[PDB]
Design a protein around this ligand. Sequence first.
Ligand SMILES: [Ca+2]
Ligand SMILES: [Ca+2]
Ligand SMILES: [Ca+2]
Ligand SMILES: [Ca+2]
Ligand SMILES: [Ca+2]
Lengths: 360, 360
Amino acid sequence: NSRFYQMSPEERLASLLNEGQISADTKKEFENTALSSQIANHMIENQISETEVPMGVGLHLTVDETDYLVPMATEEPSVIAALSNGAKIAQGFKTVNQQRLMRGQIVFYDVADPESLIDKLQVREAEIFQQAELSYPSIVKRGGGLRDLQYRAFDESFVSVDFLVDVKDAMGANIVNAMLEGVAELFREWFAEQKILFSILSNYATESVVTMKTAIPVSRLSKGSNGREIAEKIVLASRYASLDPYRAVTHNKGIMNGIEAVVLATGNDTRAVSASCHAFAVKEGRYQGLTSWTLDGEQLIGEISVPLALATVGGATKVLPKSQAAADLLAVTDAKELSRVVAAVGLAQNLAALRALVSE
Amino acid sequence: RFYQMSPEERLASLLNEGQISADTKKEFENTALSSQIANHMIENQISETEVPMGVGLHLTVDETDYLVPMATEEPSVIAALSNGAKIAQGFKTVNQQRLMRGQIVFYDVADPESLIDKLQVREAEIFQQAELSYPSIVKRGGGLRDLQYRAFDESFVSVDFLVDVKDAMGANIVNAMLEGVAELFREWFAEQKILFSILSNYATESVVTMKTAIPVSRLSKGSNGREIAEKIVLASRYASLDPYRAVTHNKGIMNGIEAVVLATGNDTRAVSASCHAFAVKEGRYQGLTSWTLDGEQLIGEISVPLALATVGGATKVLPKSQAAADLLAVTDAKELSRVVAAVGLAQNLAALRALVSEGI
Ligand SMILES: [Ca+2]
Ligand SMILES: [Ca+2]
Ligand SMILES: [Ca+2]
Ligand SMILES: [Ca+2]
Ligand SMILES: [Ca+2]
């Protein structure tokens, strides 16, 4: 409690055993680790062991005519089998649209004249962009950096300056934070009368949304001759999810079984993706499903749209050897392609869940 | 054939086919979870993901001290939880419920309110069938407790099941009853059609409310502890106005909650989906905590649906889950949910205190 944060992992475990907080078999199991103790102990604080999540391979996924082998880390049975089944039925997925910009905000408070403050800033945008480069030049040399500023006001007392930043293949926490912390020091020289509450990245990556679709002949749905009937019930089930939040949450949870499994296997931040995806499910003031299914002629059409600010470098994507091994199997080129594969996984998982759900 | 292969044949096939390098194969083979367990929990298993697990410190809930196992790949999370709990000193339970939710959904219903009327006069037979489908839970003092009915779109009827599943998450119990009762509905109403009968992950009857009261002097090592308290109340209030902050505000909460959920072998997707959906109040995605200033004491409160488990799923089959359970030493799932919700509030306190102290 006092020296635990300075203790070595071996001293921590011995301390817990000696104080009776763990048994001898518990200590032996905590010591049964495959991630290097020097890596683990430097990644987090008070480190003592690791959690092991089985990792399997999702099969038959094809996105934009390209085959993939999807690494999926999950503790839940049938998740990988369902992804492989839905992907085989869909045959292929196609990209509809995609953007990739990370969001940040500098928030003012006790603003007497909100509309006038944003007008002061809108004319000096060229100098805000220049201060952004100075606060983080590396990303600008890599070909990214601030791409757009936006302005919003709330409760007649808050003013949010939004930053849309190209963070390239990283998630962008350090880029955006440092960039906005420097641009905030400039905001304070310009307007000493105004006050800043905080300057931080936003995980609601509405400018990293990917939209994927699939078009399935109803014949492919069932090996029998009931495919059209199964398609109609899939459309109804998907429609019902956007009517009843108690189904929407389960509907989207099923999607995240696949999405989070790839996110985890590749060393990405699972809380960030879950937060942004579930928040994005809130449309028209209501929590709805993240996918849509419609019947057009003899073809079942599915579509998904999710904010996926994923990373192929930084964070835990490289420091953890298993992240790199998973990336070798997946063989994506950049983060944009990762988001496309992950979105297609979500839609494939949704197809398998719905088909199994309504086939009675 | 990949599905039928052993884990070793799979890795050999991936290398021989040119999909992974020899270095990657060797890293996939560096595993600590027994191959027999991993290969039986999931499909197409090849390896595992290792997430560093540490110990959150200084957490006190209802005058009981805990050592919190936390599995995360993000630095500073475990340290921030320990610090937030240290400042908090203690956490008190406000209210708690623990019932799991299921639903049988009819479609193409000519008169939803008329079908509901016919159902409400057969509840004794439904309850009787629910027990016959899964008698074990009834003997251990649980089982179906309530039935509710909702109509949607003038064509759907949802029969809602509220079930006491004791220390399990409850998928097998709930789905067993729903299947049995659904077959009864098909005999009773041959003209009606059932779309699906499945567990719902939106556990609104498993919500836990936790609170804390901190003298403002504890927020700062200096003398502006009441200032930092005022700015924490502003940052929290702002989350209830701007969704781009509410997602980040709640993401920070889940850094703690998901870390414990993962360490204890619980379903991370289920908790994430239910918590983020529960954040939608008044048609707006808002924060899951509230912070207010009452004199010289900062008051924090959290309210989250936590249908967590101490048995079933992966809470025991994964040896690290049992080890984590030993460290935390919780008697039942209800207690687990109280501890995890307190972890969420402490993590939020540490994040908000740091967010505003930077702006000063
Ligand atoms: Ca602009
Ligand atoms: Ca490869
Ligand atoms: Ca590529
Ligand atoms: Ca009635
Ligand atoms: Ca113990």
